[PDB]
From a paper:
More recently, because of the documented carbapenemase activity, as well as a structural characteristic shared by other serine carbapenemases (i.e., the disulfide bond between Cys69 and Cys239), [name] enzymes have been included among class A carbapenemases, along with KPC-type BLs. The peculiarity [name] enzymes share is their ability to extend their hydrolytic spectrum to carbapenems by single point mutations. Among [name]-type BLs, [name]-5 exhibits higher carbapenem-hydrolyzing activities and nosocomial infections caused by [name]-5-producing strains that often respond only to amikacin and colistin, representing a growing concern.
In the work presented here, we set out to identify more soluble inhibitors of [name]-5 carbapenemase with a higher ligand efficiency using a structure-based virtual screening approach against an in-house determined crystallographic structure. In the case of [name]-5, the oxyanion hole is formed by the amino acids Ser125, Thr211, Thr230 and Thr232. The alignment of these structures revealed that the binding site was rigid, with root-mean-square deviation (rmsd) values of the active site residues ranging from 0.094 to 0.274 Å. The binding sites of [name]-5 and KPC-2 were structurally very similar (Cα-rmsd between 0.433 and 0.462 Å), and the residues interacting with imipenem in [name]-5 were conserved in KPC-2. The major difference between [name]-5 and KPC-2 was the substitution of Ser170 and Ala243 in KPC-2 (KPC-2 numbering) with Asp166 and Arg238 in [name]-5 ([name]-5 numbering). In KPC-2, flexibility of an active site tryptophan was observed (corresponding to Trp99 in [name]-5). We assumed that this residue could also adopt different conformations in [name]-5. The binding sites of [name]-5 and KPC-2 were very similar, especially at the level of the targeted oxyanion hole.
Author numbering: 19 to 286
């Protein structure tokens, strides 16, 4: 069956690359299509910036936040990998929406932390996962320490299945207004950081949007959505490959994209 070949193809990559691959594919209602180590915890790394932007839009939707509110900051908000926050530093602020878009499409850490400083910190991020029916994902720290991915640490983790269901809830399951949903969907399609990861392994006519993440200790992740054969899906991929190079980890995730494609093409 297509599900056995999916598993054995992922196990081959896992053996040969000395890696662990967690994957969940769900339909728009969160129904499982396929998975592998789907309920093992993995560090979210930057993937949590997608749900963080969803949280931001829920606050906009409810009138407790305004997308063009200016958020002021100084040099101390600049951390590793803050390309847009660095550019906007002299101006002295980014708006809520500028920071959210940079968090999503550039994985900007300063922008992420600026939003966390506005929405009530890691506790409030965790509270939003619970609100949207995810009892698993948890943010405990800001960037970059939340990406430390110390082996066995449950802080700052999710599972493939919980996060795939979270993605589905946000894009398909009515969590946000239609306006807010469409905005975040387009940001994911226009993501700047995902060209060499999952989307590299999908057919070119599939509509795909995703958010990547990289952790210390070999974490490399990609979550998002794809539309194939008039069928919509949500997908979460988390991998741990301590001995691969960064480029090899990209290749690993693209290879997982290929394995997913083969399952979907085989699926009645
Ligand atoms: Br599992
Ligand atoms: Br303002």
């Amino acid at each position: 069956s297509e599900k056995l070949t999916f598993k054995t193809d992922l196990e081959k990559l896992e053996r040969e690359k000395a890696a662990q691959i967690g994957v969940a594919i769900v339909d728009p209602q969160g129904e499982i299509v396929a998975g592998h180590r789907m309920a093992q915890r993995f560090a979210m790394c930057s993937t949590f910036k997608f749900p963080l932007a969803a949280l931001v839009f829920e606050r906009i939707d409810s009138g407790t936040e305004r997308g063009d509110r200016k958020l002021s900051y100084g040099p101390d908000m600049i951390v590793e990998w803050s390309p847009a926050t660095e550019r906007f530093l002299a101006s002295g602020h980014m708006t809520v929406l500028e920071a959210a878009q940079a968090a999503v499409q550039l994985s900007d850490n300063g922008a992420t932390n600026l939003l966390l400083r506005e929405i009530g910190g890691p506790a409030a991020m965790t509270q939003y996962f619970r609100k949207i029916g995810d009892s698993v994902s948890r943010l405990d720290r800001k960037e970059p320490e939340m990406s430390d991915n110390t082996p066995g640490d449950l802080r700052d983790t999710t599972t493939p299945i919980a996060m795939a269901r979270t993605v589905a809830k946000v894009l398909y399951g009515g969590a946000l207004t239609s306006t807010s949903t469409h905005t975040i969907e387009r940001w994911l399609i226009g993501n700047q950081t995902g060209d060499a990861t999952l989307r590299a392994g999908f057919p070119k006519d599939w509509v795909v949007g995703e958010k990547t993440g990289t952790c210390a200790n070999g974490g490399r992740n990609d979550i998002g959505f794809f539309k194939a054969q008039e069928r919509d899906y949500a997908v979460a991929v988390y991998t741990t490959a301590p001995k691969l190079s960064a480029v090899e980890r990209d290749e690993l995730v693209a290879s997982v994209g290929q394995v997913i494609t083969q399952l979907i093409l085989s699926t009645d």
